[PDB]
Amino acid sequence: TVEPYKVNLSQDLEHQLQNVIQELNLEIVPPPEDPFLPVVLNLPSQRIGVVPWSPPQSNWNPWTSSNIDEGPLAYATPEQISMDLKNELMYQLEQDHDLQAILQERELLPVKKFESEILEAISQNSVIIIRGATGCGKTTQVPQFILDDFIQNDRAAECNIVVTQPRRISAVSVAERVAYERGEEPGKSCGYSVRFESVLPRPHASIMFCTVGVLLRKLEAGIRGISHVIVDEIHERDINTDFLLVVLRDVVQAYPEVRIVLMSATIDTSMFCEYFFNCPIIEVYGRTYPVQEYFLEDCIQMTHFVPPPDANCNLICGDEYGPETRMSMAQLNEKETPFELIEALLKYIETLNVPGAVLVFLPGWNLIYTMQKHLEMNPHFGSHRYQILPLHSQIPREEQRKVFDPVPSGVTKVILSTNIAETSITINDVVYVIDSCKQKVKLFTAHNNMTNYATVWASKTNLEQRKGRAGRVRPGFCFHLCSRARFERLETHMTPEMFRTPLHEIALSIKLLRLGGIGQFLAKAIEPPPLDAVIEAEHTLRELDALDANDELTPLGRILAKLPIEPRFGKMMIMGCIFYVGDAVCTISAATCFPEPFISEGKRLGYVHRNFAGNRFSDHVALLSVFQAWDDARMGGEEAEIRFCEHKRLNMATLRMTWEAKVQLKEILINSGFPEDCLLTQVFTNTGPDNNLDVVISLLAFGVYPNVCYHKEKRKILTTEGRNALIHKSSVNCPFSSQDMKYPSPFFVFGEKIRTRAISAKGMTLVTPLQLLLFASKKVQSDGQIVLVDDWIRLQISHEAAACITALRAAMEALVVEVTKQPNIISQLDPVNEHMLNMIRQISRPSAAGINLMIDY
Ligand SMILES: Nc1ncnc2c1ncn2[C@@H]1O[C@H](COP(=O)(O)OP(=O)(O)O)[C@@H](O)[C@H]1O
Ligand SMILES: CCn1nc(C(=O)Nc2cccc(NS(C)(=O)=O)c2)cc1C
Numbered sequence: 001t002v003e004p005y006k007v008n009l010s011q012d013l014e015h016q017l018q019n020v021i022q023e024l025n026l027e028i029v030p031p032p033e034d035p036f037l038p039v040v041l042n043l044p045s046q047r048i049g050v051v052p053w054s055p056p057q058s059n060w061n062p063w064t065s066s067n068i069d070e071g072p073l074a075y076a077t078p079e080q081i082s083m084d085l086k087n088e089l090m091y092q093l094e095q096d097h098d099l100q101a102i103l104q105e106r107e108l109l110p111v112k113k114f115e116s117e118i119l120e121a122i123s124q125n126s127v128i129i130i131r132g133a134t135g136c137g138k139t140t141q142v143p144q145f146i147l148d149d150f151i152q153n154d155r156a157a158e159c160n161i162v163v164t165q166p167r168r169i170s171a172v173s174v175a176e177r178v179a180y181e182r183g184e185e186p187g188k189s190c191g192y193s194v195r196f197e198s199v200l201p202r203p204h205a206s207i208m209f210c211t212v213g214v215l216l217r218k219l220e221a222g223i224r225g226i227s228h229v230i231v232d233e234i235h236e237r238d239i240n241t242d243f244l245l246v247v248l249r250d251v252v253q254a255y256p257e258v259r260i261v262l263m264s265a266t267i268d269t270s271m272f273c274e275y276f277f278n279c280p281i282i283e284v285y286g287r288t289y290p291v292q293e294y295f296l297e298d299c300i301q302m303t304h305f306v307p308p309p310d311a312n313c314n315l316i317c318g319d320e321y322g323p324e325t326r327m328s329m330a331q332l333n334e335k336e337t338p339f340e341l342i343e344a345l346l347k348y349i350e351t352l353n354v355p356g357a358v359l360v361f362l363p364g365w366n367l368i369y370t371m372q373k374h375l376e377m378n379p380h381f382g383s384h385r386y387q388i389l390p391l392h393s394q395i396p397r398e399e400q401r402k403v404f405d406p407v408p409s410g411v412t413k414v415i416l417s418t419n420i421a422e423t424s425i426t427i428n429d430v431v432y433v434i435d436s437c438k439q440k441v442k443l444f445t446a447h448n449n450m451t452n453y454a455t456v457w458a459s460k461t462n463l464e465q466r467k468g469r470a471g472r473v474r475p476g477f478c479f480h481l482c483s484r485a486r487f488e489r490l491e492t493h494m495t496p497e498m499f500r501t502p503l504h505e506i507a508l509s510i511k512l513l514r515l516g517g518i519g520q521f522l523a524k525a526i527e528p529p530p531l532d533a534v535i536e537a538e539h540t541l542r543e544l545d546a547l548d549a550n551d552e553l554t555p556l557g558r559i560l561a562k563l564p565i566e567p568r569f570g571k572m573m574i575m576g577c578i579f580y581v582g583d584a585v586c587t588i589s590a591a592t593c594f595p596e597p598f599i600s601e602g603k604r605l606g607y608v609h610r611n612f613a614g615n616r617f618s619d620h621v622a623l624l625s626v627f628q629a630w631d632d633a634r635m636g637g638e639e640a641e642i643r644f645c646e647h648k649r650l651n652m653a654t655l656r657m658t659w660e661a662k663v664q665l666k667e668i669l670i671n672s673g674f675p676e677d678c679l680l681t682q683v684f685t686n687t688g689p690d691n692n693l694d695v696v697i698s699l700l701a702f703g704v705y706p707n708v709c710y711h712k713e714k715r716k717i718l719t720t721e722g723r724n725a726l727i728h729k730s731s732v733n734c735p736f737s738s739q740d741m742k743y744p745s746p747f748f749v750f751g752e753k754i755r756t757r758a759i760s761a762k763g764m765t766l767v768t769p770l771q772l773l774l775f776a777s778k779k780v781q782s783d784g785q786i787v788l789v790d791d792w793i794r795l796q797i798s799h800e801a802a803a804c805i806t807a808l809r810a811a812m813e814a815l816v817v818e819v820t821k822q823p824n825i826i827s828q829l830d831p832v833n834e835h836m837l838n839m840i841r842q843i844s845r846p847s848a849a850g851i852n853l854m855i856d857y
């Protein structure tokens with residue numbers, strides 16, 4: 001219902017645009033004959049493969065994928081290497097009484113009694129499954145059993161083990177734990193490798209813990225110098241793990257000397273067993289105690305709790321309960337987690353007078369933070385009685401480790417945990433579980449580019465696994481916060497991720513690794529993804545020009561396949577290289593992989609954070625400005641860095657991890673033949689004229705498409721599907737109070753469209769209508785006076801200017817194709833290319849759209 005927006009475009013710029021399109025002989029759609037017929041302005045390599053395998057070799061580092069050339073290990077024999085490592089190990093165990101005591105704890109883990117059986121099963125079979133309760137010792141012990149079996153039988157040199165974990169936090173933490181159990185730190189017998197961080201193991205007799213993504217990205221040259229591949233936690237149905245299971249089944253068939261070990265919680269593993277040619281299953285178990293389970297009804301009755309003022313299963317309650325119980329329950333909204341009942345349940349646990357930790361399953365960091373604040377508002381829950389520790393993947397590792405620590409007598413340890421504590425880790429001392437009965441899942445929808453961090457019901461299987469966490473120490477209690485009539489309607493299993501995740505990154509891996517057709521390869525998965533997801537991945541890669549018309553990998557596609565970020569951000573970074581702003585676009589790209597460095601606490605930003613934005617109405621400009629200020633403050637050394645981050649309320653670990661990620665992305669571009677000088681750090685101002693920053697913001701519009709919106713008033717924006725939405729509270733563009741912002745343009749690009757109670761735009765950058773047309777527009781129809789952009793917004797702008805700006809986009813797209821075939825043409829600064837680039841540089845200026853950001857509006 002919004003009037004066409006008037007673009008203020010000067011006569012000089014209109015003619016410059018016309019001149020550049022004419023000088024470069026670019027094709028333009030002429031103005032229509034009659035208005036009521038409007039016109040759109042928008043107008044190969046030759047066609048199954050197996051990843052090769054090869055066993056460890058004495059002169060080969062399987063982790064660096066290189067020859068050992070310097071030092072003794074180059075020429076040393078397998079026999080020398082093996083006895084040296086055996087002797088070194090024997091001596092360490094003789095001398096180290098703290099290590100001896102660590103080994104004695106190891107030997108009491110339930111998995112220990114199966115050691116012989118596991119090693120016999122692995123030696124005689126290409127593939128096995130190891131199945132047992134969470135906490136038996138599969139993850140920490142089985143790679144050690146295998147390594148120590150080789151070291152003790154004078155074959156240390158013949159053993160290199162890859163262990164895949166479905167989570168970053170698990171790969172790092174397991175490496176640290178297994179190192180500690182071997183009297184070391186990561187970098188010797190154990191190492192880890194996650195997306196933008198590694199500590200490599202030694203080249204011989206060693207275990208690498210990695211994410212599946214890291215391993216797939218390293219498979220271009222094959223699996224070279226590895227004896228064992230252990231795929232951990234298969235029961236989680238992590239999509240990258242399901243995918244790797246397809247790759248490894250082909251590997252096993254063609255190279256039967258490899259050893260594959262799949263490890264699983266107590267689930268039906270028959271599907272995996274059959275998929276891997278009815279491979280043996282080794283059952284692992286130890287002592288478990290019975291656990292009394294309770295539902296929302298029982299929790300209300302036991303605590304006499306009374307609340308304040310799909311079909312609702314809290315209206316259903318059996319008649320063997322009180323009428324206060326049934327009436328109390330009936331007031332509880334199932335879409336909320338009842339924080340006050342959790343408090344009431346903690347006090348009830350005190351009355352049982354049996355010491356033991358309480359594990360509380362909450363969906364995500366949001367409700368954990370909320371539950372924590374809640375309890376610290378009651379001095380009942382102070383240090384004198386309570387140790388309340390948050391467990392989620394974004395808390396530092398020092399804090400994560402604290403959940404294993406013992407507590408002073410008459411203190412209760414309470415863990416507010418994500419589902420990490422479901423099957424991945426075992427917290428000892430747990431006697432009590434409070435189960436929200438919820439999961440956090442990322443649901444994406446391509447049709448409206450909507451992200452939903454949805455709070456959904458857990459499965460029966462998740463409730464069983466959660467209940468069983470209370471029953472490892474003594475008889476236990478599990479308090480399920482769903483009614484008995486919600487339990488009945490729960491699925492048996494969560495949907496595997498393969499059914500509900502975009503596949504374009506897996507599609508690029510399939511093509512980089514030459515495993516054949518995308519649909520063909522995915523049809524061999526243990527549970528193939530739905531047709532529509534495959535069609536959408538192929539459509540996405542074709543639109544990006546990552547695949548040609550024949551669906552073969554382009555030079556562009558190859559680069560995007562080697563970059564561990566969203567392909568569209570990979571293309572944005574290639575464009576930043578061409579414009580000589582590579583370092584800035586690599587910083588924006590890296591930051592999408594990490595939480596916000598602003599410590600804002602889910603409330604509106606204050607003055608200090610807002611000042612990083614300058615006059616650009618841009619969260620992305622705020623981010624680049626904190627990176628510049630922080631990098632400068634770091635020249636003073638560690639304490640100056642720590643004080644900078646404390647005074648400015650910045651998360652230091654986030655800034656450092658993002659910088660490191662930026663460095664690695666830049667390295668992958670350098671090695672793809674991009675020149676050093678297009679990727680140098682460039683000083684910029686966030687208030688004065690800056691053509692480099694102008695271009696970065698143009699390229700950001702490209703990167704985050706189709707996330708464009710139109711500001712109505714206050715916090716209300718219109719999205720591309722015509723619908724209403726809110727400016728996210730955390731944005732520099734969110735009003736601090738009642739004073740209204742005076743945006744010199746109503747057009748905003750943003751990092752993610754979020755579905756909660758309402759639709760929110762988070763990570764918001766103001767763009768001009770020129771930038772909208774150039775980089776945030778797939779389709780533009782003109783009637784001669786008015787243009788319609790992707791059927792949701794109208795601009796009053798000369799037909800010729802809009803047609804010229806569409807031609808610039810097409811020209812830029814064609815340069816990206818040329819630059820990816822030969823990246824060093826960036827260096828040539830060919831004058832026909834520069835003439836087109838300088839015109840994009842010009843229409844990236846606020847002044848091109850009649851905006852001066854230094855003059856208040
Ligand atoms: N960081 C740690 N601190 C203390 N104990 C730990 C740590 N990591 C693992 N453990 C303990 O090691 C044991 C075995 O864990 P794990 O190997 O993960 O078993 P599984 O893979 O069979 O679930 C558990 O009792 C667990 O608590
Ligand atoms: C180049 C140095 N480097 N390497 C890594 C890395 O994760 N390597 C890795 C991971 C898993 C397995 C293998 N070996 S393989 C392909 O299975 O044979 C190798 C990280 C860094 C900085």
Ligand SMILES: [Mg+2]
Binds near residue numbers: 138139140232233423
């Ligand atoms: Mg495990």
